[PDB]
Design a protein around this nucleic acid. Structure first.
Ligand SMILES: [Zn+2]
Ligand SMILES: [Zn+2]
Ligand SMILES: [Zn+2]
Ligand SMILES: [Zn+2]
Ligand SMILES: [Zn+2]
Ligand SMILES: [Zn+2]
Ligand SMILES: [Zn+2]
Ligand SMILES: [Zn+2]
Lengths: 107, 253, 86, 97, 98, 95, 97, 82, 95, 104, 254, 105
DNA sequence: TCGGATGTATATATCTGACACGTGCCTGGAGACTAGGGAGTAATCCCCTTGGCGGTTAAAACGCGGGGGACAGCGCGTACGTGCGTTTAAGCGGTGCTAGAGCTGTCTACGACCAATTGAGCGGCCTCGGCACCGGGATTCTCGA
DNA sequence: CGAGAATCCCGGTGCCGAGGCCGCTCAATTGGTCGTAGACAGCTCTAGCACCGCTTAAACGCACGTACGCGCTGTCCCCCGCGTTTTAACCGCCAAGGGGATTACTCCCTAGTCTCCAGGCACGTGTCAGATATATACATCCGA
């Protein structure tokens, strides 16, 4: 009967069916609405895009065409909102932001 | 607040000109209204800050927020990301309508020359700056001493070095003329916040020099380079003016 | 049938290493009493994290602590770690 | 040189059906209106009259700002608009305290 | 006769050097020995995955650097450019660990 | 062989959408994966608690939206809710 | 006449208010503050007395917890008087800004 | 629309809070700063509380909304429920 | 009314066990209730995550014990564990 | 009752019912609610004991939230357990820094 | 480490128990320091032993000691987080029950005052004294003379001691009322003594306090003094302090 | 006042269950407060990680971390049992009377 | 006041391996379906939030003398940085041994589930004693001499 | 030493919330089938552990010295303490009614289930992004 994916119908890339399955068998509720998986997939895909964009920018700044954890870190720690979102999150091999206090600067 | 005035409550609409009327335009007319303060050129992919309604080029404002403070380049207000902005279709369409030619390259050199024209067309008060020769990255400046500040008729020389990532990085501005000042180094280095930390990509040499004149008018004894001068300026005032006028009449005049 | 008891490996964390960590932290000048303090703090941190991790390991009836045990242990301490799973 | 009969909708207010008198734009959508227009409009609806986007949760006045940059364009393009506005304003404030 | 920087330049050079890098700072094997020494008090004959040790070290160094930032801030707050145990203890206290 | 699922291909597709001429490392890939997993657990958790608070046994798009409003800060939350509403609307239309 | 050394009755105030458990901030204007802040999220809101009391308990607890760290930040700088920079440092290390 | 009300947090009240916090001497620029911090705090809490109230489709902010907000903010409050 | 329940009577009983001539106010009782509920949700939650991490769909006394070992610090854990291991033993002596 | 069979005062049945719902897992162990109720009863016992002593020190017979606060904050383990917990009407422990004491 | 048995320990023979029915004579002061509670200065009852240092206390005594004061051991300053860091010692209870069948169910707070008074009169500290002014045992008068090898050598110093209601769980308020020129000794009477302020333990006695002051007179603590004027007096250093304090205090005492 | 009691009545509180003799250099496991001779319990904890008496786990990995030298108890058994200290010291002296190594023991 | 010794930013040849895309494969996702049921929603009891007198008085404001403390300047002194020589061992890999994680098939004891049914537990009423209240007086820190 | 509050103490009294009894509703208990997750012996093989000489980066040790921690100190000044004056929080409390709780009930929506199949992953393979290194030129720091 010509089957199509729920992700294609929602105009998304992230798997709707997979998210739905994880929600069902993730001990979150007895039942789950039909809008929950598409909405959640949409949010995850959006956040993914928003991070990958700034990460791509930081990657371009370092003359590299492959995004590394350092670029992700530079992308997140500059974005105040993303930083608050990942405040209790440690990114492996991401290092820290280049920041030197004014007092430690040469006289 | 937003309380309407006596006229605003009963204001009458201005009827649109329906009759065919042609309006001749010039690139100097809507210049300041359509110029991106960062690259000093025609707007392209217009992004407008949500909080203060300031127009920037997409590449310009993005590069500004990525390679500098999270402030608005014009009014210095919190701008955490591109999400604190919004694309302006009407504005960009208006610009593309009036100016079909569009924009070109956004090189640092082009903006340096844009500053050169911006100086030649309307010079600052008691300030000037221009290239020493064929090189456009090595500039020389001249700042005449203001009336209020004890440097009357000083006419001090300065040296300006533009970085490659201009204007996203502040130009190295120093002094070549000896001057008795608490914020100015004995070699020529300047202790100015907009020349180090709080630099804006929308700032120009004109505004910098004006800030230096304003600095001469009112020194900043809080974080100086030469401690004893600041101490003299804080404790007394006669000695400061005297020595300043001496160094002005000896090393400047 | 193979055992081995380790002693005094906290001194393994050397002075210049702590110095380097301080540099990345953005420190110009470092005191002498800093290093031992750092060794102590690191010792406590590792004590807690490895304790929870080993707890996870023993709960899984395994004799090998995996990376996921470390990830869970860190996550329950409010220190989520990306790049090792989870 | 371009015909003004084409640059109208970019300077046309969709509430008064005329040119922008003291331009005021909404933050969340950058849709421009007249101040005297949009101030009394948001006394009822807290949504945009064009894209139907929520201006603010409760107080829409916090999400509207005066666009002088646009109003300057409107005044510089339309011939004798500032003069007309000033004339009518003075003429109205002439017979009132 | 010889060349010597003023005491402060090399430090700043090191700061600029390591704030750009991302690789681990603490040596691998000693850290492994420390991990196993600390672990030998919870479970006998423990086996460790390489990724587990690496995760432990990543989190450890991250934690120590993060602590060193706050410590440095405490040092500067007392009008000093030198970190002291008082600074670390204050940081730990405010963070709610001590 | 016991295949282990991952969000690799999806975040890769997104990467190609936002940056067609950039690459991605395996480490950063695993990091992004852990990120999406974490955010998933967060939103789903808060939605679950939302359903339990109101004596409801069903997590709808409303619970997810409210959860996003609670978790994501400011404009991030705004754009997130925007994309979510767009997706659920487009899904609602196209049967 | 009758005087006290600056820092004595203040210390007595510390010792007195640390013993007590009652709320410190005035109830009514705090409630007014809460209702003032809440109007930017939902129009025409109603509050349970227990809700306002909860908000006040949490607020006073938060502030009285912050003032301790602030005081420590003041003593760390060889001072006995708290300053804005101490609060800034406290909230900085706390991880709020 | 309510008034300023940020000045409702009077000087002697903040002084009291500092006393309970164990502060001997207080600066003058402390009070305004404290008002700001309290403003940000109350904003962050009341926002989430009102969010919980709206998801429950209620026009009245309950105590449990505040408790949930504080709990998800990382400041669990005993003596009201949950 | 809907019969709003709590841990009132039990807390009172244990109170009269540890202190026969000692009472408790309403607010303090509500606080104790909030404590019991909080610890309940925390232990049960950690146990849930424990079961989920090991692909097991059952929360036995083992998961609860491990959760206690993870949550309660120091001696507080130990004794508690004992009080658990004790109880579940007696329950198996009369069932 | 299962509480009587386990020698517990806390409701094993109620705990079991609460574990059934709340979406923690598919099925719940039979010894799990016993263990959990036992732990809850233990913690309750400890806190009520220490707070009882705190009430004794204040010449009171009825325990107020202040006593609960005193009991919790005077125990490093309990304090760690309730680190991110605010006790209503509990106040703060009496503490004045040494440098704040009068001098000269 | 530190448990490696020596040459003798690796082959030590068991000390055979005395099985022949002989009686042992013990005075009521024979096992004093071994069976005495450091807190209430009386025989142990419901003995609790700290897990870290193996120090014995009474149940209520050590519990109350924990709830009101530092969370450390009253005898060796080693820390214990709560009452769970100590286990009940029934062996001591049984041994006590067999040796001294007299638990005496009455402790604190006047009783500890009296016992400490007897312990004061039995053997006072070096050149010191302390005893109640009148019938009230909560208000004592202590007389401390001038210790040898000190700038206060020679003279007499009277001070008052106010015992709290919850003594010994709270430190006694000691006020020096003889006007002595000392760094930590205020002119008003207050003494900046750490063990009398925050570093107080229920196992401390008036003897130990007066001894601490006696040692304080010789070598003071300029780290946290009561008066800043003497901070420079010890920066002179120990040459001008023996001619300024011996003529203002010692001259106003002897 | 002077009390006198049979030493055999006090023996069960002064004797070691591992060697059957009086406590010498008393050492106590702290997870159950149980005392033995130092050498006895040290040698035992190389064969078992659980208590000889109540079978309570001394430690999960290293039992030596949960034993402490019990001085007060040793003082009690030295004061109650007559001539015990003299005898033990005599043993220590007689042992090193032919062996010249490691005095501090 | 400035040119030369350090070492950082920068440029480009060049080999290496992990990023990336093709492929057979297999399982999870999609499609059509019924019907139990949670949830929608109009209806209605009625608790609890909200307004507002006015009258009080303790609490908040304003102001002023001044004493303790923030803060900039200076100097004795030592602890820590910089750089080179001696030396410890981390990092390298080469690799055999096998612990033990991981997967599979089988046997079986665990717990949800429907059902019968009685008390444990909550809403609710009431006598009373802990405790907030109250005011005379004990008395203990404080500030000056 | 002595004046003066100001916290503590003590005997008396008004008051309301803590505690025990009771009607009774509903959730916990008792008991049996049975699908099935969990226990578990059995088995493939990934991967962790010990090995072990070696180039050398790095930790270590130490001498010289200067920026910096730290105590000392004089001076401007800003909170402290307190009496008076201005101001509104607090309280009693009757009363309008929004709106949260509960209930009766039709029904849209999701779990449940067998089937078809292609989306997703493990596997294999070619090479371009990047690590690498000799090699420039460059910005930058510092004494005679
Ligand atoms: Zn531009
Ligand atoms: Zn702006
Ligand atoms: Zn709009
Ligand atoms: Zn208009
Ligand atoms: Zn001890
Ligand atoms: Zn005792
Ligand atoms: Zn023995
Ligand atoms: Zn034992």
């Amino acid at each position: 009967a010509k089957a199509k994916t729920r992700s294609s119908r929602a105009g998304l890339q992230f798997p709707v069916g997979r998210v739905h399955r994880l929600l069902r068998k993730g001990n979150y509720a007895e039942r789950v609405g039909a809008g929950a998986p598409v909405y959640l997939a949409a949010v995850l895909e959006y956040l993914t895009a928003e991070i990958l964009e700034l990460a791509g920018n930081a990657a371009r700044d370092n003359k590299k065409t492959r995004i590394i954890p350092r670029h992700l870190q530079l992308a997140v720690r500059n974005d105040e909102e993303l930083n608050k979102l990942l405040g209790r999150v440690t990114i492996a091999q991401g290092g820290v932001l280049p920041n030197i206090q004014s007092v430690l600067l040469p006289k | 607040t937003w309380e309407l005035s006596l006229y605003e409550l009963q204001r009458t609409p201005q009827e649109a000109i329906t009759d065919g009327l042609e309006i001749v335009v010039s690139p100097r007319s809507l210049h300041s209204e359509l110029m991106c303060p960062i690259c000093l050129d025609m707007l392209k992919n217009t992004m407008t800050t949500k909080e203060c309604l300031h127009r920037f080029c997409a590449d310009c404002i993005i590069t500004a927020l990525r390679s500098g403070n999270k402030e608005c380049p014009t009014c210095r207000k919190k701008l955490v990301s591109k999400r604190s902005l919004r694309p302006d279709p009407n504005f960009d369409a208006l610009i593309s309508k009036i100016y079909p030619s569009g924009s070109g390259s956004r090189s640092a050199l082009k903006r340096i020359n844009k500053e050169l024209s911006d100086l030649a067309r309307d010079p600052p008060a008691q300030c000037s700056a221009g290239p020493v020769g064929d090189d456009m990255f090595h500039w020389q400046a001249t700042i005449m001493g203001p009336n209020d500040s004890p440097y009357q008729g000083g006419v001090f020389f300065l040296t300006i070095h533009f970085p490659t990532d201009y204007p996203f990085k502040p130009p190295k501005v120093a002094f070549t003329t000896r001057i008795y000042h608490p914020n100015i180094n004995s070699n020529g280095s300047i202790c100015l916040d907009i020349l180090r930390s709080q630099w804006s990509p929308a700032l120009t040499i004109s505004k910098v020099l004006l800030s230096i004149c304003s600095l001469l008018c009112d020194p900043n004894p809080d974080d100086p380079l030469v401690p004893e001068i600041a101490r003299i300026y804080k404790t007394d005032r006669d000695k400061y003016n005297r020595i300043s006028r001496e160094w002005t009449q000896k090393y400047a005049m | 049938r193979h055992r081995k008891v380790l002693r005094d490996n906290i001194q393994g964390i050397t002075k210049p290493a702590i110095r380097r960590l301080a540099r990345r932290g953005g420190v110009k000048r470092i005191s002498g009493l800093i290093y031992e303090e750092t060794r102590g703090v690191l010792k406590v941190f590792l004590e807690n994290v490895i304790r929870d991790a080993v707890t996870y390991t023993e709960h899984a009836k395994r004799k090998t602590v995996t990376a996921m045990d470390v990830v869970y242990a860190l996550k329950r301490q409010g220190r989520t770690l990306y790049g090792f799973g989870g | 040189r371009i015909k003004i009969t084409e640059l109208n909708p970019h300077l046309m207010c969709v509430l008064c059906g005329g040119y922008f008198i003291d331009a005021t734009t909404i933050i969340e959508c950058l849709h421009s209106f007249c101040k005297t227009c949009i101030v009394r409009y948001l006394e009822t609806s807290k949504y945009c009259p064009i894209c139907d986007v929520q201006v603010h949760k409760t107080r829409p006045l916090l999400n509207i700002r005066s666009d002088k940059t646009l109003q300057d364009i409107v005044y510089k393009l339309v011939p004798g608009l500032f003069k007309n506005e000033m004339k009518r304003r003075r003429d109205f404030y002439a017979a009132h305290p | 006769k010889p060349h010597r920087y003023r005491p402060g330049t090399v430090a700043l050079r090191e700061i600029r050097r390591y704030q750009k890098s991302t690789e681990l700072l603490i040596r691998k094997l000693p850290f492994q020995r420390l991990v196993r020494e600390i672990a030998q008090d919870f479970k006998t004959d423990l086996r460790f995955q390489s990724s587990a040790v690496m995760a432990l070290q990543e989190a450890s160094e991250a934690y120590l650097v993060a602590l060193f930032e706050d410590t440095n801030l405490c040092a500067i707050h007392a009008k000093r450019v030198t970190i002291m145990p008082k600074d670390i203890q204050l940081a730990r206290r405010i963070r709610g660990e001590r | 062989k016991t295949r282990k699922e991952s969000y690799a291909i999806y975040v890769y597709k997104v990467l190609k959408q936002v940056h067609p001429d950039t690459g991605i490392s395996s480490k950063a890939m695993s990091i992004m994966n852990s990120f999406v997993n974490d955010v998933f657990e967060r939103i789903a958790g808060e939605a679950s608690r939302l359903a339990h608070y109101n004596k409801r046994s069903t997590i709808t798009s409303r619970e997810i939206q409210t959860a996003v409003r609670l978790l994501l800060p400011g404009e991030l939350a705004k754009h997130a809710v925007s994309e979510g509403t767009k997706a659920v609307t487009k899904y609602t239309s196209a049967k």
